[PDB]
């Protein structure tokens, strides 16, 4: 694999990307926060093969957390083989052993929608271990269900951790500031006013006039969203994905095509963002069309 393969279709600047791999090589734990539809899931699979430098998925593990996920599933816990219960090494525990076998090669674990599940309960023993300076056998710790003190778990140095959390819900946020310290938080923005986003459209037979009209409009609207941080923060602003997908057949992005999606997707979204203001819904919706 090579770097440029990823960057061709990526709307985010490389400057952010260079910042990202710099931290990740250092910190080994990171959190990518933005609104939905900005390619967090998109970049993450790409990014792993960059960091390794080779497109090895076996060294990559990708999971989505949720409420029905626990330390028993993740790390270790007792589960039924059948008649007899057994100790079942969780998925992360298995992943760490694989990386130990090949210390040189970087092994990467990808957690989508991390902010949902109670990380405090899930990581637990890991919450201390995962930090960049505390990895290795010197800091080996026995687990809850370890048979004796000698059975101990230490994070390998090669491991890199990726955290993916949407900023739409203030309810689900990583308020545990101690947990915040382990992770290096890099915001990601919608990136409408980018060449690579525009080049993708023009490459798909798009009008440069329509494009400049488009990006300017959303940029103003997204900025309006960031303004009312008390009500709706910058994290709430619309992503670029709505416009991205749907042209695979070859349909040209005319003004009509945009007008169709706005009615179907963003319009009810706008209604929710402005529960109290119908005019503000009417204002921006009509603003787009003309």
């Amino acid at each position: 694999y090579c770097l440029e393969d990823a960057l061709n279709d990526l709307f985010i600047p490389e400057t952010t990307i260079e910042t990202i791999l710099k931290r990740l090589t250092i910190k080994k734990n990171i959190i990518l926060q933005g609104p939905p539809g900005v390619g967090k899931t998109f970049v993450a699979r790409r990014l792993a093969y960059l960091l390794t430098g080779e497109k090895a998925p076996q060294r990559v593990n990708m999971v989505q957390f949720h409420q029905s996920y626990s330390y028993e599933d993740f790390i270790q816990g007792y589960r039924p083989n059948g008649v007899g219960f057994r100790r079942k090494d969780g998925i992360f525990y298995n992943f760490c052993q694989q990386a130990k076998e090949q210390p040189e090669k970087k092994y990467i674990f990808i957690i989508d929608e991390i902010n949902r599940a109670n990380l405090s309960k899930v990581f637990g023993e890991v919450m201390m271990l995962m930090e960049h300076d505390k990895r290795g056998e010197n800091w080996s710790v026995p687990l809850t269900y370890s048979e004796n003190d000698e059975e101990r778990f230490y994070v390998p140095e090669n491991v890199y951790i990726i955290g993916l959390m949407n900023t739409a819900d203030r309810s689900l946020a990583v308020v545990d500031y101690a947990l915040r310290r382990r992770f290096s938080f890099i915001d990601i923005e919608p990136g409408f006013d980018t060449p690579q986003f525009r080049n993708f459209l023009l490459n798909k037979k798009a009008e440069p006039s329509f494009v400049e009209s488009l990006c300017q409009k959303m940029n103003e609207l997204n900025q309006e969203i960031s303004k009312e941080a008390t009500i709706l923060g910058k994290g709430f602003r619309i992503g670029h994905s709505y416009f991205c997908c749907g042209l695979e057949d070859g349909t040209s992005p005319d003004t009509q095509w945009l007008n169709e999606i706005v009615m179907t997707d963003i319009a009810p979204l706008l209604e929710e963002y402005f529960f109290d203001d119908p005019y503000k819904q009417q204002k921006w919706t009509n603003k787009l069309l003309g």
Partner: protein, 336 residues
């Protein structure tokens, strides 16, 4: 029998609680004002999303969920009927913080004297929270919530519920409620006045430093070092700046609202505060008495016993920004 217009009092509570349009609402009485924000405030929260706290649940289920507690299962022999005692963390909105809001809404609806629209909209929201369990509210519940894990926004709206609950009186009916005539009592109004200023001063007077100072008597007594018998003395506020220190003693009195004799007994407290206080910097010592008046504002300065003291008033009922203008204008004179 005059009191301040009710709308402006809400601003004082806001500074008192340390954190909107009231022009739209037509209800002069307070409860219309307070409920509208609460009714609207919950709607502001729900847009972002209400707080969900992982609540552990340990129960008897037909399968493995989370962590099985081996002990409780074997002791109860639940294996035989295919059941386990297992612990897992269901995520609910039924926490104390959310429960307080919902039960309060019943009180708000039950209030006998209230705007029709406010009562109707709240009844909608009360239905809109089916999962939450109603509760019988006490300060002890609010007492447990001093942790304040919730957001800054939650803590503001919660304080509102505290005002309502304590200032709710049953009226004509056994079920329904009637609001307290808060304005009439001076004492809480005074504690409102003192608390309003202290947090207010931190906001606007970034230039100066604002702290309450406890004071100790200069006395020595052969009988007791404790001096428990002596009155306890704690400043209402002290607002210290490099050029000048300044202590304020402010209280809410009904007599002063009448434009005659003057009620200034609090001055007696003030002088002894000046004496027991000794400044290391020794730049200067100044005092201020500030009171609420209805009609107009009057300012005087005095040089009494080697101290520079001000008596001043504020024309509450005028306008909140001009009042906000006036207060900052006031301190600029004396803080020098």
């Amino acid at each position: 029998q005059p009191v301040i217009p009710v709308r402006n009092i809400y601003y004082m509570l806001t500074y008192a609680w340390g954190y909107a349009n009231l022009e739209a609402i037509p209800g002069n009485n307070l409860l219309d004002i307070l409920g509208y924000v609460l009714n609207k405030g919950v709607l502001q929260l729900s847009r972002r999303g209400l707080e969900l706290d992982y609540n552990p649940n340990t129960e008897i289920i037909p399968g493995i969920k989370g962590r099985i507690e081996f002990a409780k299962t074997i002791r109860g022999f639940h294996l035989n009927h295919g059941k386990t005692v297992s612990t897992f963390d269901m995520l609910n909105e039924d926490t104390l913080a959310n429960r307080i809001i919902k039960s309060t809404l019943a009180i708000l609806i039950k209030h006998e004297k209230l705007n029709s629209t406010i009562r109707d909209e709240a009844r909608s929201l009360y239905r809109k929270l089916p999962g939450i369990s109603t509760l019988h509210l006490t300060p002890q519940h609010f007492s447990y919530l001093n942790g304040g894990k919730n957001t800054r926004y939650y803590k503001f709206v919660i304080s509102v519920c505290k005002f309502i609950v304590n200032n709710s009186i049953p009226g004509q009916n056994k079920g329904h409620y009637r609001f307290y005539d808060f304005e009439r009592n001076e004492k809480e109004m005074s504690l409102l006045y003192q608390k309003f200023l202290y947090e207010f001063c931190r906001r606007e007077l970034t230039s100066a430093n604002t702290t309450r100072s406890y004071l100790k008597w200069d006395a020595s007594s052969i009988s007791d070092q404790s001096l428990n018998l002596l009155p306890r003395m704690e400043t209402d506020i002290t607002i210290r700046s490099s050029e000048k220190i300044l202590i304020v003693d402010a209280k809410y009195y009904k007599s002063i609202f009448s434009r005659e004799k003057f009620h200034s007994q609090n001055l007696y407290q003030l002088m002894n505060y000046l004496w027991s206080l000794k400044p290391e910097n020794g730049e200067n010592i100044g005092g201020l008495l500030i009171y609420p008046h209805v009609d107009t504002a009057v300012k005087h300065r005095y040089k009494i016993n080697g101290f520079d003291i001000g008596l001043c008033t504020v024309n509450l009922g005028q306008e909140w920004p001009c009042i906000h203008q006036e207060l900052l204008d006031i301190f600029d004179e004396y803080l020098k």
